[PDB]
Ligand binder design. Structure first.
Ligand SMILES: *[C@@H]1O[C@H](CO)[C@@H](O[C@@H]2O[C@H](CO)[C@@H](O)[C@H](O)[C@H]2NC(C)=O)[C@H](O)[C@H]1NC(C)=O
Ligand SMILES: *[C@@H]1O[C@H](CO)[C@@H](O)[C@H](O)[C@H]1NC(C)=O
Ligand SMILES: *[C@@H]1O[C@H](CO)[C@@H](O)[C@H](O)[C@H]1NC(C)=O
Lengths: 106, 277, 230, 53
């Protein structure tokens, strides 16, 4: 019964609006926005770069997300980085899987 | 009638989803057992590891009567019925086996004979001992067995209450009275059913690929099958060894090979057995 | 007379892209008569060894092995042996080496544990344990890096793989990086990389620092604007 | 329109045409679902399980 206007995945916002149906009377029925936004609370500022510090200031521009480095990982997409590896004198750069269940071989 | 009477709804606490974990549980990973020497090679299911006892964990000390003892296990049984069926509703599979396995596991926790090293199990055992009175070890074990055998009716009726809130008009199934079957045989049956379903799936894939078409994808299918059988062989070895050690003590298990014990009774597809011979 | 054959770890298979078998013979007299060709399952050989040193720190003989076997042969698991021609042994010694066949492949889980608050109260050194759980077989390769560039191998020490206490066939690996306490307090990101065959991308990475690993406080600036929306 | 009609959702879409416009059509929309709302419940959970949304 609620219309999901905007569902951005990185900001993990859920812009959805619902109307409570009133009784038999002139219309004063309440229109609501059922916005339910979720914080990671432990992710870093550069989501692709693992070597970033903790992000504390989360800026949620609600008008902007309707239509910028993004907050939480999405299981559909891959956020991957390259890490150096050494067996000796040689240095080899190998792509790594930052999050499971997203880039698993399917 | 083969149904349950209208049971009043009691407050139940939420439980974490069984499919919340991305790994979907690990059969191989076993956390705690009573002893891995006398009970070697037994595998704990994800269902037992995810067995949500939050309702009894809150009031395991404030409880002082057997009427509340029956009522509290009804509350957690309803939560398990909601959790198991919702998990299998997404999976589109029959949840009766999970319901009865969870009931039997809960009953063995009530006994204290459940093949687990939980202090929660010890706490519930001590609470039930102080409910009925303190006696010697064998006497209190036998009294707890008798009490659970007498009072399992309400718990099992709550389980089909959770079952019939969804199935509705279709008749309720029968108890099947497997409560005499211990924990490890039931875990063997659950493991066999799970691994037989996965063998059905993987064998269907490897047939549909290799038998019709050596394609690289077919070679990958054979490699996946090889990896899975290599993963599952030590589990079979340990469980069969356990069956051989505890072989002689029941009549139903007098059949010599463990695979035919799995095959001849219940909860199996009669397809594969992973014998080393 | 000491002889050892070291299987090539999966890091040697992956990073070097070449399978190099070494059957080292050390702590013995020097005769310089070493000519060893790695025998395959059949009688033929692939390649001879290279770079034999006729000196040792304790004035003895140190030998090494070298070969280039295709990776598909190792996937097949054919048995390989190293036989010695060097003249001190009256009879050649054979060390049968091969990849085990039938072993399970469980993906390892890389887990980072921050230093305890009791140790951080000392203010000299901070120890971080890279604890790996549930990999099969034992051969696991682990690295430590700071902010993207690697550390020296002396800074971090990793233990030999050991059987899991309760799991039947799994193994656990435990590695420690010892650093000064003030570096941990500055917030430098300390990361651990584990290489194994059963991983999806063969490399998975985890990062821990002061703000991530058991932080004392959660500082969050929860700002929002334009609640009217469009 | 009748006041009863606007209470039910008909999306009352507005369409225009002009020269200095890219598509030659700009589509605007008003209904009872979108508008100034009476109630705002902004709900945040301080979740620790991240990377799953
Ligand atoms: C930090 O975020 C920036 C985006 O603002 C990224 O930097 C570049 O990202 C592109 C696309 O992934 C890469 O092709 C470039 O190589 C990145 N730049 C550098 C210098 O590597 C990236 O997500 C983050 N930066 C780093 C260094 O990880
Ligand atoms: C905590 O956050 C506030 C507001 O973002 C900032 O002013 C302050 O410096 C922060 N303190 C620390 C120790 O990060
Ligand atoms: C917002 O309020 C409505 C009722 O007015 C309620 O149904 C809805 O669940 C609320 N939103 C959240 C996130 O709880």
């Amino acid at each position: 019964e609620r219309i999901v206007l905007v569902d951005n995945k990185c900001k993990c916002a859920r812009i959805t609006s619902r109307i409570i149906r009133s009784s038999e009377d002139p219309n004063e029925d309440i229109v609501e926005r059922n916005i339910r936004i979720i914080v990671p609370l432990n992710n870093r500022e550069n989501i692709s770069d693992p070597t970033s510090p903790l992000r504390t200031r989360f800026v949620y521009h609600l008008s902007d997300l309707c239509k910028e480095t993004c907050y939480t990982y999405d299981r559909n997409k891959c956020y991957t980085a390259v890490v150096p590896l050494v067996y000796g004198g040689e240095t080899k750069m190998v792509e790594t899987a930052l999050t499971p269940d997203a880039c698993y071989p399917d | 009638p083969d149904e349950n009477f209208c049971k009043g709804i009691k407050n139940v606490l939420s439980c974490p989803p069984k499919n919340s974990t991305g790994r979907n549980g690990d059969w191989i990973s076993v956390a705690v057992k009573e002893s891995s020497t006398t009970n070697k090679g037994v595998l704990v299911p994800p269902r037992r590891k995810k067995l949500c006892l939050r309702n009894i964990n809150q009031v395991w000390h404030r409880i002082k009567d057997e009427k509340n003892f029956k009522e509290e296990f009804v509350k957690v049984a309803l939560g398990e019925s909601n959790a198991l069926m919702k998990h299998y509703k997404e999976k589109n599979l029959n949840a009766l086996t999970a319901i009865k396995y969870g009931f039997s596991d809960m009953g063995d926790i009530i006994k204290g004979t459940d093949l687990i090293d939980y202090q929660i199990t010890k706490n519930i055992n001590r609470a039930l001992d102080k409910i009925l009175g303190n006696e010697t070890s064998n006497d209190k074990i036998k009294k707890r067995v008798d009490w659970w055998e007498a009072n399992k009716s309400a718990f099992w009726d709550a389980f089909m209450c959770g079952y019939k809130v969804h199935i509705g008009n279709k008749p309720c199934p029968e108890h099947d009275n497997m409560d005499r079957i211990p924990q490890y045989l039931r875990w063997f049956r659950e493991w066999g059913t799970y691994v037989c379903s996965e063998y059905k799936n993987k064998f269907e894939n490897v047939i549909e690929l290799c038998n019709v078409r050596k394609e690289d994808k077919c070679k990958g299918a054979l490699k996946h099958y090889e990896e899975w059988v290599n993963r599952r062989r030590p589990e079979w070895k340990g469980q069969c060894d356990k069956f051989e050690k505890e072989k002689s003590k029941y009549e139903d298990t007098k059949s010599r090979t463990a695979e035919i014990y799995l095959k001849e009774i219940c909860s199996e597809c009669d397809c594969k057995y992973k014998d080393l011979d | 007379i000491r002889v050892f054959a070291i299987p090539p770890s999966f890091a040697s298979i992956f990073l070097t892209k070449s399978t190099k078998l070494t059957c080292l013979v050390t702590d013995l007299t020097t005769y310089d008569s070493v000519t060893i060709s790695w025998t395959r399952q059949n009688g033929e050989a692939v390649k001879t060894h290279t770079n034999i040193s006729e000196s040792h720190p304790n004035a003895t003989f140190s030998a090494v092995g070298e070969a280039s076997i295709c990776e598909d042969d190792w996937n097949s698991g054919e048995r390989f042996t190293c036989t010695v021609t060097h003249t001190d042994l009256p009879s050649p010694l054979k060390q049968t080496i091969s990849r085990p066949k039938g072993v399970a492949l469980h993906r390892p889980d890389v887990y980072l544990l921050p230093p305890a608050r009791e140790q951080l109260n000392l203010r000299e050194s901070a120890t971080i344990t890279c604890l790996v759980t549930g990999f099969s077989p034992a051969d696991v390769f682990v690295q430590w890096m700071q902010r993207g560039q690697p550390l020296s191998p002396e800074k971090y020490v990793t233990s030999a793989p050991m059987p899991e206490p309760q799991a039947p066939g799994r193994y656990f690996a435990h590695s420690i990086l010892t650093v000064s306490e003030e570096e941990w307090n500055t917030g430098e990101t300390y990361t651990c990389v584990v290489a194994h065959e059963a991983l999806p991308n063969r490399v998975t990475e985890r990062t821990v620092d002061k703000s991530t690993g058991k932080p004392t406080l959660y500082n969050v600036s929860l700002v929002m604007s334009d609640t009217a929306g469009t | 329109v009748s006041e009863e009609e606007w209470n039910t959702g008909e999306t009352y879409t507005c369409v225009v045409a002009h020269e200095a416009l890219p598509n030659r059509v700009t589509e605007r929309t008003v209904d009872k679902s979108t508008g100034k709302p009476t109630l705002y419940n902004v709900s945040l959970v301080m979740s620790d399980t991240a990377g799953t949304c």
